Amino acid sequence: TLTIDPMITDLAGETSRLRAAGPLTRIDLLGVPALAVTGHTLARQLLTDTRLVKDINAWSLWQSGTVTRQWPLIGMIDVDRSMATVDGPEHRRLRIKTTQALTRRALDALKPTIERYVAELLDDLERAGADGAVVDLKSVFAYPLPMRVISALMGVPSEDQEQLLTWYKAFFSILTPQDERLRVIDEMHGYFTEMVRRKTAEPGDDLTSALIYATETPLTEEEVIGNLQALVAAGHEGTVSLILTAVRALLSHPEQLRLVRDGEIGWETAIAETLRWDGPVIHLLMRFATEDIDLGDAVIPRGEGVVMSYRAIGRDITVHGADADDFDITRATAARHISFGHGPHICPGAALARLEAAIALPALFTRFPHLHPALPLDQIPNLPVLTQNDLSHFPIHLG
Ligand code: HEM
Ligand SMILES: C[C@]12CC[C@H]3[C@@H](CCC4=CC(=O)CC[C@@]43C)[C@@H]1CC[C@@H]2O
Numbered sequence: 001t002l003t004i005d006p007m008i009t010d011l012a013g014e015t016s017r018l019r020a021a022g023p024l025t026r027i028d029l030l031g032v033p034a035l036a037v038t039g040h041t042l043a044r045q046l047l048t049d050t051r052l053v054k055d056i057n058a059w060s061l062w063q064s065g066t067v068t069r070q071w072p073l074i075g076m077i078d079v080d081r082s083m084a085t086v087d088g089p090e091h092r093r094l095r096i097k098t099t100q101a102l103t104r105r106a107l108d109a110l111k112p113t114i115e116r117y118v119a120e121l122l123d124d125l126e127r128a129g130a131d132g133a134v135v136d137l138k139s140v141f142a143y144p145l146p147m148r149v150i151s152a153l154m155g156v157p158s159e160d161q162e163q164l165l166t167w168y169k170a171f172f173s174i175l176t177p178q179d180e181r182l183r184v185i186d187e188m189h190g191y192f193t194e195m196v197r198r199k200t201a202e203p204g205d206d207l208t209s210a211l212i213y214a215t216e217t218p219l220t221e222e223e224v225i226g227n228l229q230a231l232v233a234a235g236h237e238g239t240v241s242l243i244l245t246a247v248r249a250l251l252s253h254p255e256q257l258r259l260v261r262d263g264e265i266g267w268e269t270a271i272a273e274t275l276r277w278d279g280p281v282i283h284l285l286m287r288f289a290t291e292d293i294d295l296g297d298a299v300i301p302r303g304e305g306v307v308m309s310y311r312a313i314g315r316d317i318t319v320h321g322a323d324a325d326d327f328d329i330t331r332a333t334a335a336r337h338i339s340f341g342h343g344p345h346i347c348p349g350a351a352l353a354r355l356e357a358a359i360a361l362p363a364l365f366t367r368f369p370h371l372h373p374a375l376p377l378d379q380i381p382n383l384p385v386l387t388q389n390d391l392s393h394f395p396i397h398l399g
Contacts, residue, residue: 001026001033004283006072006174008382011282011311016325018312024298027307029386032067034286034305038312040319040338042295047343051290052306053087054345058288060303072174075185076285076387082226084345091344094223097214098231099348101153101207107355110153117148118360122367129398134374137394141364142243149356150235154228155199155206164191168233172385192228196221207231231349237388239353241280242271243360244391248380249274249327251373256329261365265329271357273329276314276337283387284308284341310339311389370399 002017004027018025023039037043046052056077061067069078079085083095100106121141128135147161156164170176170184196208200221203209211224219227250257250270259265286305293300300306317324320333340347347353365371374395383390 001028002036003028004030004386006030006386007384008386011382015312015315018309019315019317022309022312024295024300027309029285029307030072032061032071032073032305034307035300036283036307036309036312038309038316040313040316043308043310043313043338044342046287046293046306047308047338047341047345049293050087051293052287053290054085054287055087056085056286056288058290058303059286059305061305063303069182070178072176072178072181073285073386075171075181080189080226080229081222082230083348084230085226087344093216094219094227095348097211097219098207098227101210102348102352104351107352110149110352111355111359113152114149114356114359115363117145117152118363121145122363125368125398132397134395134397137247137396138240138244138391139393141360142240142247142394145243145360146239146353146356147236149239149352150232153207153235153352154231155204155208156195156232160191164188164232165236167191168236172237172383172388172390174384174386188229189225192225192232196225196228234347235349235352237390238280238347239356241389241391242274242353242357244394245278245280245389246271246274246357246361247364248373248377248391248394249278251371252377253327256327257365259329261369267358267362268354269334270329271354271361272337273327273331273334275339276320276334277325277327278389279310279314279337279339280389281310281339281387282389284310285387308341310341314339368398371396372399373397 002021002025005014018036018038023037023042025036025038027034027036037046056062083091086094121144124140125135128140147165151158151161167184167188170180199208200212203213208228211219211227250260260267260270285307288306289300289302289304291302314337315324319336320331340350374397380394381392383392
């Protein structure tokens with residue numbers, strides 16, 4: 001069994017240990033055992049296997065009361081009913097209105113909004129960078145942008161977004177005391193409950209109102225609340241990491257940065273290789289076997305929990321080759337990654353996340369062509385967030 005270090009002290013060694021022990025291996029998540037899927041081919045297979053569900057009531061550890069809400073990771077699994085917790089035909093019903101809102105056409109009408117948030121945040125970088133002062137790319141640029149974009153889509157007031165970010169920081173950190181974590185989870189549920197009620201009595205041009213007023217069976221209020229929570233949480237968290245890890249990877253590989261600025265390699269292709277090599281998700285919790293799953297050299301027992309170790313999956317040497325642990329935007333398999341998932345629960349906002357990074361990254365390097373880091377890589381740790389690739393900071397000189 002591999003114990004996942006909640007402090008993320010040795011992410012590179014742990015990721016390689018997971019790859020070496022895979023494609024299926026036992027992990028320990030803060031005292032709770034589970035199975036981690038670390039192989040790319042096995043992941044794609046299980047992600048489309050209908051004997052694996054997200055419903056926590058299918059977990060034997062939850063049924064028996066062995067895992068309770070005292071577990072610091074329980075907020076990642078015991079969530080309100082939504083597209084993230086259901087499978088089968090009900091899943092399509094809880095997802096279809098959202099996917100209609102995230103089409104290639106639908107995002108075109110949203111593209112100018114993103115471009116304005118980007119331009120506003122670039123000005124914040126310039127203001128904080130007066131007199132050659134080092135600026136935190138994260139806190140000034142990468143962290144606020146995805147929250148402003150998902151808030152505009154969902155209809156979250158601008159005045160409320162700081163509070164949401166404050167809640168999410170405590171929610172993700174393993175250093176949050178468990179009584180405070182549970183209080184924040186409750187306060188967040190109460191916030192989105194009251195927002196859904198407010199939008200029910202006053203709909204707007206936003207996705208929350210669309211989820212309430214669709215004209216199949218209408219979503220229950222619980223399901224709208226659950227979808228809203230999953231959309232804001234995933235919608236703001238992942239893209240922050242993507243923007244920062246892409247900048248970090250290209251600044252430390254200047255010859256590849258030259259390729260994208262000169263147009264030899266598209267930004268969309270650099271974003272794909274960032275997702276494969278250093279993506280926003282480390283481990284995805286959690287799936288549960290409704291019956292014994294015979295793989296042929298291993299069995300997944302009924303009721304067992306199954307984690308998708310997407311970071312290890314991205315480093316799969318069988319699919320990507322011997323240099324899988326290297327960042328190379330020119331590799332042929334960069335588009336074959338599954339860092340947005342696979343199967344029916346594949347990220348519904350994958351196109352929006354790709355668009356946000358595809359706007360922000362060239363915007364950043366056009367506005368500040370000579371930007372460079374103010375800290376070396378060994379002084380940029382991950383935050384203690386076990387399941388997410390969350391960077392502490394990225395100080396830069398604007399140049
Ligand atoms: C770089 C940015 C992002 C990454 C890497 C990412 C990745 C993922 C992954 C790995 C999953 C779950 C796959 C699984 O179940 O195994 C997921 C689910 C989900 N994501 Fe994303 N995501 C990103 C951005 C977004 C955005 C922008 C939105 C919304 C606009 C979003 C909304 C969701 C939702 C609602 C789910 C649950 C879908 C379901 O269970 O049917 N995410 N995402
Ligand atoms: C894990 C995640 C952030 C946490 C999200 C999760 C989707 C379901 C969910 C809804 C909540 O109420 C809290 C956070 C969670 C648990 C997201 C899937 C993509 C992103 O990485």
